[PDB]
């Protein structure tokens, strides 16, 4: 996150860190807890390492430096990548992760609500993006979970800044005209949440973008409301 500030315990209790352990262990992506046994993230997080065994998922965590050899983590039982997602591209950039065991809820580990069928035409005005990504282009993974407030833009505005790509109705974009606040590398797969009628809703999944916090260069997010039939089918069907 560029231009953000430190989050607090309990502030974003759905935020998870998806890490890979080979010889060394590294944070690769964010994700969002959406049920006891379900995390929602970006499909692209699995382009390089598509197999489940190397992944470790940390929840109820503020500071990555708190992780030690003994820190408990969830494991991946199933990765469900959208059937129309193409590796390395921006369409249908969404994946469900089923955990090997269900997690209990606490005030520091609980789910983000998904958008409601009633809120199809809602214009969201208090939106935030979180993660442990770089605080500048070619920076470093941040220790304490960062947060930043970013306004949504229209798809037409977003398309003006991405002439080489197609912005679709299944994407949503967010950014400031003069830049300065944005997601960056390592935030991908994490949440874009907006507070509507007193509750937080998962509106986006951090997906792609050119640079970080550049002027007239919004971030692109998978628009979660457009995948609700798919989420409910894949989850209900699995359990």
């Amino acid at each position, epitope marked *: 996150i560029v231009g953000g500030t430190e989050s607090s315990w309990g502030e974003w209790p759905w935020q998870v860190s998806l890490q890979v352990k*080979l010889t060394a262990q590294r944070h690769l992506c964010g994700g969002s807890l959406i049920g006891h046994q379900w995390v929602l993230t970006a499909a692209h997080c699995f382009d390089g390492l598509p197999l489940q065994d190397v992944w470790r998922i940390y929840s109820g965590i503020l500071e990555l430096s708190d992780i030690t050899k003994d820190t408990p983590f969830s494991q991946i039982k199933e990765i469900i990548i959208h059937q129309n997602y193409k590796v*390395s591209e*921006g369409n249908h950039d969404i994946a469900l992760i089923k955990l090997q065991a269900p997690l209990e809820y606490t005030e520091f580990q609980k789910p983000i609500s998904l958008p409601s069928k009633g809120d199809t035409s809602t214009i969201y005005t208090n939106c935030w993006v979180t993660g442990w*990504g*770089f605080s500048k282009e*070619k920076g470093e993974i941040q220790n304490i979970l960062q947060k930043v407030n970013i306004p949504l833009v229209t798809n037409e505005e977003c398309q003006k800044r991405y002439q080489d790509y197609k912005i679709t109705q299944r994407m949503v974009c967010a950014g400031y005209k003069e830049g300065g606040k944005d997601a960056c590398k390592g935030d991908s797969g994490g949440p874009l949440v907006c507070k509507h009628n007193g509750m937080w809703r998962l509106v986006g999944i951090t997906s792609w973008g050119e640079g970080c916090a550049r002027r007239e260069q919004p971030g692109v997010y998978t628009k979660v409301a457009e995948y609700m039939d798919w989420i409910l089918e894949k989850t209900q069907s699995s359990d």
Partner: antibody
Framework: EVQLLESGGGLVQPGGSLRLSCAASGFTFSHYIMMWVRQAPGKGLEWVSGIYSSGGITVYADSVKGRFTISRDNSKNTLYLQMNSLRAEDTAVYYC???????????????WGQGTMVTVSS | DIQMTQSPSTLSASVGDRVTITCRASQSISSWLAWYQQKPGKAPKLLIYKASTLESGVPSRFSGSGSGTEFTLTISSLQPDDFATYYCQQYNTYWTFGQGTKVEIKR
């Protein structure tokens, strides 16, 4: 970050062979086009070989076609350049480079190694 | 082969100058053109790709324009770190580099 380290450079006689390696380190979800580029003493950069996807198009500059073979051992995370029938004019620093496939993800289009020196002389 | 020609071959400038370098392709390469900076004894560094997109981490004083066969790189205000050789690269068909433009200190 993702990092690239070349090795295998050295002194070889005309007609001899040499195999360069480029070992990739780090974790990434990105896929890459993989190239070898060289620079002779006091000269410009010259692209010589590439591989566009896993087991995909391997291609060569006319200057090396028929003498060089580019390959990947994914299990070792390593890119190779096998160089045969070497000649004086193949003398150069050899660099491996990765180029990002697909949409930008707040990340880099190019990754470059450090270079390894190859000297062909009798 | 697609041949790439840079001009000028050398150019002399001072800190604070606006500097422009041109690259010509022997046939159309659409916008598949990149620009690099290289210092003696070091690997080159990517500045600009797809003719005008700024690479991750590159300062905003660098910009590029053009499409087809004629391209420019501009350094809006030259800094001490910018004296170096610059190469264009077509990537329409494989890669081909231009011969380079050295940017040196005027006196």
């Amino acid at each position: 970050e993702v990092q690239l380290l070349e090795s295998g450079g050295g002194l070889v006689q005309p007609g001899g062979s040499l195999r360069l390696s480029c070992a990739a380190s780090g974790f990434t979800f990105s896929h890459y086009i993989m190239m070898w580029v060289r620079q002779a003493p006091g000269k410009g950069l010259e692209w010589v070989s590439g591989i566009y996807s896993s087991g995909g198009i391997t291609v060569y500059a006319d200057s090396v076609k028929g003498r060089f073979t580019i390959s990947r051992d994914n299990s070792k995370n390593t890119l190779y350049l096998q160089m045969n029938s070497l000649r004086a004019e193949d003398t150069a620093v050899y660099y491996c480079a990765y180029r990002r496939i697909g949409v930008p993800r707040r990340d880099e289009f190019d990754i470059w190694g450090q270079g390894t020196m190859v000297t062909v002389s009798s | 082969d697609i041949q790439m020609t840079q001009s000028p071959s050398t150019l002399s400038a001072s800190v604070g100058d606006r500097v422009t370098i041109t690259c010509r392709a022997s046939q159309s390469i659409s916008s598949w053109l990149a620009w690099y900076q290289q210092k003696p004894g070091k690997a080159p560094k990517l500045l600009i790709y797809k003719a005008s997109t700024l690479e991750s981490g590159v300062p905003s004083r660098f910009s590029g324009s053009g499409s087809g066969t004629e391209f420019t790189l501009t350094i809006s205000s030259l800094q001490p770190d910018d004296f170096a050789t610059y190469y264009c690269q077509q990537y329409n068909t494989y890669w081909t580099f231009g011969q380079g433009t050295k940017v040196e200190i005027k006196r």
